[PDB]
Every structure is written in structure tokens, then in C-alpha cells.
Amino acid sequence: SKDPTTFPLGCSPDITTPKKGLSMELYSYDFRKKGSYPCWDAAYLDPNYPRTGYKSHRLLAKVDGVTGNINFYYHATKGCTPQLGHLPASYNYPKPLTMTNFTMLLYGYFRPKVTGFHTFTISADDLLFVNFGAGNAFDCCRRDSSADHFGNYQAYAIWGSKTAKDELTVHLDAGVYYPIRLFYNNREYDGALSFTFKTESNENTVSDFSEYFFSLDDTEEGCPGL
Ligand SMILES: CC(=O)N[C@@H]1[C@@H](O[C@@H]2O[C@H](CO)[C@H](O)[C@H](O)[C@H]2O)[C@@H](O)[C@@H](CO)O[C@H]1O
Ligand SMILES: [Ca+2]
Numbered sequence: 001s002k003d004p005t006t007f008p009l010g011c012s013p014d015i016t017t018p019k020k021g022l023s024m025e026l027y028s029y030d031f032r033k034k035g036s037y038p039c040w041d042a043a044y045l046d047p048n049y050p051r052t053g054y055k056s057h058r059l060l061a062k063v064d065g066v067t068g069n070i071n072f073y074y075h076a077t078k079g080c081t082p083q084l085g086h087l088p089a090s091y092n093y094p095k096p097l098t099m100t101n102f103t104m105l106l107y108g109y110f111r112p113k114v115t116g117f118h119t120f121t122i123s124a125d126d127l128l129f130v131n132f133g134a135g136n137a138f139d140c141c142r143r144d145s146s147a148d149h150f151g152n153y154q155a156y157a158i159w160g161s162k163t164a165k166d167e168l169t170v171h172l173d174a175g176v177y178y179p180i181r182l183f184y185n186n187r188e189y190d191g192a193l194s195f196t197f198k199t200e201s202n203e204n205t206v207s208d209f210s211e212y213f214f215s216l217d218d219t220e221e222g223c224p225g226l
Contacts, residue, residue: 001135002151006169008133010176011109011140011216013223018177018214021065022108024091028058029101029185031080039080040188044103045158050129050183051148054103065092066106067213073125073192074099080188099191104184107143108215109177117200118172122157123165125192129183130155132170134224137179141216141223150181176225177214 001009032041046053068090076083076099085099110132112118122128131137132154139146155168172178184193196207206212216223 002149004131004136004152004154005133006171008154008170008172008178009135009140010173010178010225011134011223012225013141013177013216015216018109018111018216019064020210020213021067021092021215022106022180022182022213023062023064023215024066024093025062025105026060026093026097027054027103027105028060028098029103029187030057031082031101031188038188040101044127044185044187049185051150054105054183054185057103060097060102061093061095063092064215066090067209069208070106071194071196071207074186074190076100076189076191100186100189102186102191104182106180106182106184107138107147108180108213110172110180110209110212111177111214112172112174113211114172114199114201115174116171117169118197119199120155120168120170120195120197121165122155122168123192123194124157124184125159125164125190126187127159127183127185128157128193128195129153130168131181132168132178134179137181139222140177140179140225141219141221143179144218177216180213
């Protein structure tokens with residue numbers, strides 16, 4: 001149920017109009033004390049960090065309606081220094097934040113337009129961990145109760161690996177709502193996130209998620225498929 005799979009389970013909500021976009025939570029991420037070498041904290045790679053550790057830091061912002069092109073590259077100018085900047089407009093959060101050092105959680109549902117094999121390509125500085133599918137990300141219209149219980153990642157990218165890029169090929173059904181969780185961190189300096197996909201049905205890369213990302217209310221019974 002929770003394991004990654006090429007045939008992720010999806011959801012069938014009883015809702016005539018879903019809400020556009022994913023939800024986002026932003027969290028602080030500190031450097032180690034001055035005189036530390038390296039200056040940055042390796043906590044971001046603690047195995048618990050994407051599940052619980054990120055919540056030991058300050059919740060900075062919680063917003064809805066994240067969609068469009070969510071890709072970014074923040075070029076820092078100084079090492080081992082908090083520097084302010086902005087997320088792209090697509091994130092619905094125009095306040096400044098420490099773009100050199102922060103954590104971001106996105107969640108909601110991906111609804112495909114076509115049926116078939118989708119190949120998602122991701123890259124990140126410093127990390128992007130992706131869950132995708134009911135159970136693997138969270139349970140259908142039962143997100144609040146299953147949010148902390150995601151399974152092993154469907155895809156991940158870590159700066160400093162051999163390549164810092166990953167693919168995920170999954171077969172999806174058009175119009176089905178698939179639970180998705182993105183977890184991002186910048187430890188220091190530059191920060192970057194790339195999230196795009198292709199399908200077998202044409203050669204174009206999709207980078208604008210405007211009619212693909214949705215939010216659904218939880219219900220007592222949930223909204224499983226099949
Ligand atoms: C490996 C390392 O410590 N590099 C320093 C730079 O910081 C890293 O930058 C990479 C991207 O190149 C990445 O964002 C990583 O998260 C950062 O830790 C930077 O501080 C630079 C300043 O001149 O020095 C490098 O040594
Ligand atoms: Ca970085």
C-alpha cells in the first residue's frame with residue numbers, strides 16, 4: 001500500500017469542482033553556530049527530517065493555491081550567510097524568506113489529462129523528495145490523519161550525489177486524482193528545484209502545472225478509487 005510503484009493508486013472524490021493548486025508549508029532551517037565547519041547543518045539528511053524533524057523548526061507560512069511553473073534557481077552571492085529572496089509568483093507567497101536556507105512542503109493531488117506512462121524529471125539543490133500515489137503519499141481524502149505516514153520515496157534528488165537528478169515513470173489514468181507530496185530543502189547558498197514531466201503521447205515537456213494540481217477536502221469516509 002505505502003510502497004512506491006509504477007502503478008500508483010488514485011482517488012475518486014465526490015466533488016463537482018476541486019480547488020486549484022497544492023498547499024504549501026514553509027519552515028526555517030538554521031546554520032550551525034559560527035566557527036562550525038561546515039557552516040551548514042547535516043540535519044536535512046537525517047532520515048526523520050522529512051517526516052518530523054522539519055517541524056522542530058519555525059513554521060514560517062502556510063498557503064494554498066500553489067500551481068503553474070514551480071521551478072526556480074536562487075543564485076546566492078555569499079557562502080554560509082542567510083540571504084533574503086522570493087519564491088516565484090506560482091507559490092502564492094510574496095513575502096521574503098531566507099532563500100539560502102529553508103524547507104518547503106507541498107501536498108495535494110495530481111490529475112492527469114492523459115492515460116499512459118508519465119515520466120517526471122526532478123532535480124534540486126539541496127534536496128527534493130517526492131511521494132506519489134495513495135498510501136505512498138497519503139490516503140485518499142484522509143490527508144490530515146495519514147500526513148506523517150508516507151512511504152518510501154518515489155523519486156529523490158540530493159545535491160552532491162553522482163547526479164542530483166531523478167526520473168519517475170508511472171502509469172496514470174486520465175482524470176484520476178493522485179496524492180502527491182514534495183519535500184524540499186536548501187541547506188546553504190544556491191537553492192534550485194526542477195519538476196517537469198513528459199508523456200508517451202507527445203514530445204513536449206510540461207513545466208506549467210496549472211490544470212494538473214488540485215486540493216481536496218478530507219472526508220470522514222475518504223475517497224478511494226476502485
Ligand atoms: C561544497 C561546498 O561547501 N560548497 C561551497 C558553496 O556552498 C554550496 O553551494 C552548492 C552549489 O554550488 C550548494 O548550494 C550547497 O548546498 C552549498 O553548500 C558556497 O558556500 C561557496 C562560496 O564561495 O563555497 C563552496 O565551497
Ligand atoms: Ca544549497
